[PDB]
């Protein structure tokens, strides 16, 4: 994708990330664990179950149209008839070719898109406090239990708190 | 200094193949087909109307052959015609069949509105060993067979119908073309036969050709069959001097003709679609189809791909 | 530290809808309609050449009925044809209606060129009551009605006009349809009648059909219009033994046809557009519009969808 | 859209914005303002403007082209002329809905992308004499006056003259 | 603190312009044309079977005009048709012309079956002067000009063929018009003359048409050309009175018929390529081509843009 | 383009650059060089090489057709004949239009995203070593020689070897 998360910076995806598309996976000292991130989950079902409603859409409510067997040749208008909708055919393929590859080009940098605007929402929560490791992964530099990663996780998480501490942790 | 948070993303075990526009085979997480691929066995009378010709393809069930009579007062969406129908009456051709044929299946219904045509002199209620119905001699019972008097007499017909009703007319008449001369004066009298059928703004004039054709249910003789149409305000009339097919009335014609035709072996069944193919009924929400370009109702854009995936997810890269 | 400075976009109250790939309601700053949904009530005369054929077709213009004379020399784009024209001449039909009326309108000029016919001892400039100038029994003044001499004479015609011109010559002549075979004798003395046009390599053979049809002002006979076109350097047979009704001579054909015909009955103005709808011209523009697939010149594409907006801002989130 | 500025971390527009796309909003011992930036303005401007000259672009030329009405049916020629005619408005409605849904997706990500390029483009000059505040804001660790204020809006702020003053505010 | 290193891309001198949405010359490293405008200055014989009509077009082919000899058993993909083809027989038209050429351009083959027609009484192997064959009278080698006995007689004709092969057949026949009563009895005897064709379920009937034509290879008079179609399990009755131009056989129809016919005259020759246009082969791999919409074969899609150039590289800005 | 690279903070391209789409500047003590990166240019160029053959893929195997040229005109049949021949001409030439636009424009983004990916994967592993000058290039706030230049290309540098010479220089 354009963005250059997943399958970029992001080496790979979390098959235990049971209940959404994107989410949080931390260490500290009491232990480890993986939440969902509804939000960004959110945005991107969104869009995809918007790009689904707007493609099975519309019609094509057609009654009397035009022959298109026949047993044998007949001549001009036959043949008229026939390079009719050999025409349609084609240009409704090329359509539905195209449409889909435009689609899941575009699905695709949806997803990493939001991939990365999770990123950096986190980032910029953290300021001071942190600093990326190049793996989707920060380092936080000072003592983070499970309500401070929770803070962090719903976007309460306060970085003047630890700032004094974290500062000093990270250049000295 | 030694706590870390990971962003990321979900995974499955195997996801599906897509394309995009710079690689054919990219595995998504989730994906959604778009192409159906799949019809039903059977033809669904509901919620379109559709009418089964069986034995008779939708010409001969407006003609009035022998088998047709299920088909009087019928009223379609989709007319079925069945590839296996029979001829079971006089040997004819229709001049402009495909043309006849779809103005009887676009119009969508079979109200037929019988008249009394005062013919001078000939015999009336012609039939012929071709046409049996139950056994016993008969003749399409929407046409009338002229023949000679007894007295050998077949005199110029003129014959006037005036439209002042509110709908539009469909008339159905023929012309005999005997095998011989002889056939032609044992029927006719004279030789040639002849017909002229005309509105204020068209006309049509025929003249039989008499001659040997194949033998066609122990006949060499053909009926050509013809049609006139006429509005509200408008008038018919009949002309000959022998070998006309007449008429016992007029087709109604919707205002409004939305109807039309499917020719299929299919059987007709009892689930519910709004989409018929040849090959059956579609069930489906998918926005193309790839079963078959011959397609009535609502339907999904007939494409000549197998299939396409939608990608309904990211990327899958598992571990 | 203790400054700050924001970066921001612009937004206003109330902004417009439209839709993307995901999203069918996506409100943004401004945006701009690409579907053409006004017309103007009138015809534009400019920078189009449109030719009004007032009580005229454009066929009853090419045959000369009348009230047709001020689409002599008439030279056109487009040719306005009104849906309450009227024919004031002698009941006919085109066998081939829609193929003369589209060569007529594509050539885009009516610039008819005399010629005398020798005709032999058959009388010529027959008239009818049916076809009133002035009051005062007339013709199409295109064709020339060719009857028996005054000694009851109708002897076979054989007469050639050869192209040695740099132009194609579109001919169109006729043949008359008697209601009895008395009308018959008395016009033409032959009893059947026949004509036969040919040119080096195409032909053209007409029997007559002798019948009582509806009658039109005072007339049950009809006549049925054919046409010839001769290349330079090809040449037009005229062969009759009775019911030709004879060219007076033929219409130029451009080399390159580029014109057309739009039937509608909204007037012509004083605008200035180079698109025409058969509900008025429009002005715009916009690469598509909603209001006809009856479109002719430099038009917007036509299109289902009453709307399409095309944003031309950034989303807008306002306070 | 695609880098979560507009509609993202930047909550809302300002209506007050009226001779611009897009600009800086400062606050500091002066005062506050507001001011329009051309660069980012004109570049989303180009791009739109573009847009819509090669869509209001093109002929459709047409005179003689076929019967599309009809007062009674005729049979087979008429069905097939109807059939075309139905075919290709089809076929031009299809073309219509994809190219604005399209274009519109695209402009909605152009107009983001500008954005974010102007806030990094900020980002960029300021050095290490200020942190994201994480709402498209920039705190600025050293005191800076209008005209300071002016060079970074111009592009002419010279980050090595507070980087001292900065550094020491930042982290002591 | 002091060292720098700098991430970039590459850059040309000159690059090329491309299309965007929003931009219409944006310069780029690299690009790839979409649109094939040029094309070889002949017709590739290989891998597709061209066969050249030269003098002969593929009515004339099929009917055996002089000249044609070499297309006999012919076979093709593409029938090269030229231009400057030359009508070598006695005068004729064919009244549904491009439908029977269209036929035979389809199927795609000059396979002829003789057949014996016991034909009663009349003199077969009619000749003509317009019809020189090595000088010396002669006619179309497919058909059979008949003519009355020396007794001056020519009885009604009732001949009958039946199809048990697995294939369908083609037979063509003619219909002769005289220029006056006195060629049609010199002829025929009768008059009027007849033929009437007819299979199980079709017909045809044609009454001659005497009348004086302009005068081809010292000839006023036309045959006009028809076709048959039998299926197998189907069969042909020819009736006539006088005027027939009979068959000497059947064209064999291919089950699949997957060729066709290119007009143009351009010549054949040693290249490689399976597309072709009336301008020549297109030896290319773009998906486009702006050189003719007359395009057979496995062909680029036809457009009207002269060039559109793919990006295939970052944009350039060098320094 | 979106990311605002190639013809944005990226003030030019290099010609010199010629065994690669993407590279390395660099000035130390020892001297300069220019070197590519084949990671990045490969992903373009891969991307590209994938468009060019999901375009250069499709039949158009047509046989049996319509008439196209005229003598002279016939009347109904022709003119549909002619219409149906220009009705298709006309869609397939807007096709391939659109189609060309949409897929310059995807390259260019492509090309400009793949860009900032490499940038965006060297500040990664520079972590608090190194500071954007905004202009494309890092400032190294220690003594990197040729060895610690490659080990940067390579991604095998390791910036806590470093940290405490570069924080110094950095901040003091
Ligand atoms: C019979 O024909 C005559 C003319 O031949 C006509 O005047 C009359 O209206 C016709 N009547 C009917 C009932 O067709
Ligand atoms: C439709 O696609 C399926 C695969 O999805 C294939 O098996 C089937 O043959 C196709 N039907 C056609 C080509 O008529
Ligand atoms: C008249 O017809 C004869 C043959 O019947 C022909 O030779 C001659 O050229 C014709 N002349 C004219 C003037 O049509
Ligand atoms: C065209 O669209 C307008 C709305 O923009 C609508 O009111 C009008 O009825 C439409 N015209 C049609 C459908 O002919
Ligand atoms: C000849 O015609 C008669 C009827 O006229 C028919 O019974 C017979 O089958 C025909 N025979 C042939 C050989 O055509
Ligand atoms: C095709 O395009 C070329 C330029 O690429 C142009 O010179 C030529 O005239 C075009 N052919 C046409 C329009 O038939």
């Known amino acids: 994708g354009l963005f250059g998360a997943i399958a970029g910076f992001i080496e790979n995806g979390w098959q235990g990330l049971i209940d959404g598309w994107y989410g949080f996976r931390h260490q500290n000292a009491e232990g480890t664990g993986t939440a969902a991130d ?5 945005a991107a079902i969104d869009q995809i179950n918007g790009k689904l409603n707007r493609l099975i859409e519309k019609t094509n409510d057609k009654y009397h149209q035009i022959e298109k067997e026949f047993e044998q040749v007949e001549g001009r208008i036959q043949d008229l008839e026939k390079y009719v909708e050999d ?86 | 200094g030694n706590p870390v948070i990971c962003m990321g993303h979900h995974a499955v075990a195997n996801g599906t193949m897509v394309k995009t526009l710079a690689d054919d085979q990219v595995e998504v997480v989730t994906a959604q087909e778009l192409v159906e691929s799949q019809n039903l066995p059977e033809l669904c009378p509901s919620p379109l109307r559709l009418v089964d010709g069986q034995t008779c393809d939708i ?40 043309s006849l044929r779809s103005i009887l299946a676009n119009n969508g219904k079979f109200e037929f509105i019988a008249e009394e045509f005062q013919w001078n002199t000939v015999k009336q209620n012609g039939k012929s060993g071709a046409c049996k119905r ?61 017909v002229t059928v005309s509105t204020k703004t068209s006309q049509t004039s025929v ?63 009892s689930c519910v679609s709004k989409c018929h193919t040849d090959k059956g009924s579609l069930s489906t929400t998918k926005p193309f189809q790839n079963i078959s370009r011959i397609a009535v109702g609502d339907c999904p854009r007939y494409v000549k791909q197998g299939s396409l995936k939608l990608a309904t997810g990211m990327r899958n890269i598992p571990e």
Request: glycine share 8%; with cysteine; charged share 20%.
């Open chain 2, 207 to 269: 003249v039989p050709n008499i001659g040997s054709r194949p033998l066609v249910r122990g006949q060499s003789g053909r009926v050509s069959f013809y049609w006139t149409i006429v509005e509200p305000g408008d008038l018919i009339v009949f002309n000959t001097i022998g070998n006309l097919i007449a008429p016992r009335g007029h087709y109604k014609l919707n205002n409004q003709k939305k109807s039309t035709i499917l020719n299929t072996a299919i059987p007709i069944g």
């Open chain 1, 87 to 172: 025409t349609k055919i084609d240009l409704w393929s090329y359509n539905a070719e195209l449409l889909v590859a435009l689609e899941n080009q575009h699905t695709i940098d949806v997803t990493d898109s939001e991939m990365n605007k999770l990123f950096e929402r986190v980032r910029r929560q953290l300021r001071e406090n942190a600093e990326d490791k190049g793996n989707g992964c920060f380092e936080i530099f000072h003592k983070c239990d499970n309500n401070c990663i929770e803070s962090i996780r719903n976007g309460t998480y306060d970085h003047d708190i630890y700032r004094d501490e974290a500062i000093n942790n990270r250049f000295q």
């Open chain 2, 59 to 98: 010409i001969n069930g407006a003609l009035g052959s022998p088998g047709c009579d299920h088909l009087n007062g019928a009223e379609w969406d989709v007319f079925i015609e069945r590839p296996n129908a029979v001829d079971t009456c006089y040997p004819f051709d229709v001049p402009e069949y495909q």
């Open chain 2, 134 to 194: 139950a056994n016993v001699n008969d003749f399409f019972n929407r046409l009338n067979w002229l023949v000679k008097s007894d007295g050998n007499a077949y005199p110029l017909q003129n014959l006037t119908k005036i439209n002042n009703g509110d709908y539009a007319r469909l008339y159905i008449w023929g012309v005999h073309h005997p095998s011989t001369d002889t056939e032609q004066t044992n029927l006719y009298k004279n030789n040639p036969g002849g």
């Open chain 1, 38 to 42: 509804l939000k960004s989950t959110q």
